[PDB]
Each structure stands twice: as C-alpha cells, then as structure tokens.
C-alpha cells in the first residue's frame, strides 16, 4: 500500500506539472466563447 501510495504522489506531481503548464492565452478565447454564449441567451430572451 505504501508502494502504491508513492505512485499516487507521482500522479499528483504529474498533475502539478500538467496543471501549471495549462495556463495559456486560450483563456481569453473562452471569454469570447462565453460572450457568444450570451448571444443565444439574448436570443433565448427574444424567444421569451
């Protein structure tokens, strides 16, 4: 169980490496995606 537990920490360490690099300018494009999402909500209000 200790042996497997170390592997879990390795995955968490990999998650740390995976998570830290995740940050990119793409986050700005998500705001555009959410901005476009409001359009359908605005159109949804038009349907209402």
């Amino acid at each position: 169980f200790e042996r497997m537990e170390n592997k879990v920490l390795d995955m968490e360490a990999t998650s740390q490496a995976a998570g830290e690099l995740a940050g990119f300018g793409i986050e700005n494009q998500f705001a555009q995606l959410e901005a476009s999402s409001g359009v359908e909500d605005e159109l949804a209000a038009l349907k209402a």
């Binding site: 169980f1 497997m4 537990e5 592997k7 879990v8 995955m11 990999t14 998650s15 995976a18 995740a22």
Partner: protein
Amino acid sequence: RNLAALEAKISEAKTKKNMLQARAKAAKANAELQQTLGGLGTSSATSA
C-alpha cells in the same frame, strides 16, 4: 477470542487494501485520461 479478533483483522486488512489498490489504480487511470486529452498531437499538422 484471539481467533475471533484475528478473523476481523484479516477480513478488514484484506478488503481495505484491495479497494485502496482498486481506487488507486482507478485514480491513475483517470489521470492518464486527462493527460492524454491534453497530449493530443494532431496540432503537429501546422508544419504541413
């Protein structure tokens, strides 16, 4: 009484480790899925 207590130790010790091992294996499997989704390589076509 020693046998009764010993049986409890064996049952809980056996089952707890197995489920721990199973979930631990499940944990890495989920982590691999997330890593692979980020590790998609079709973006290499930009060179073409």
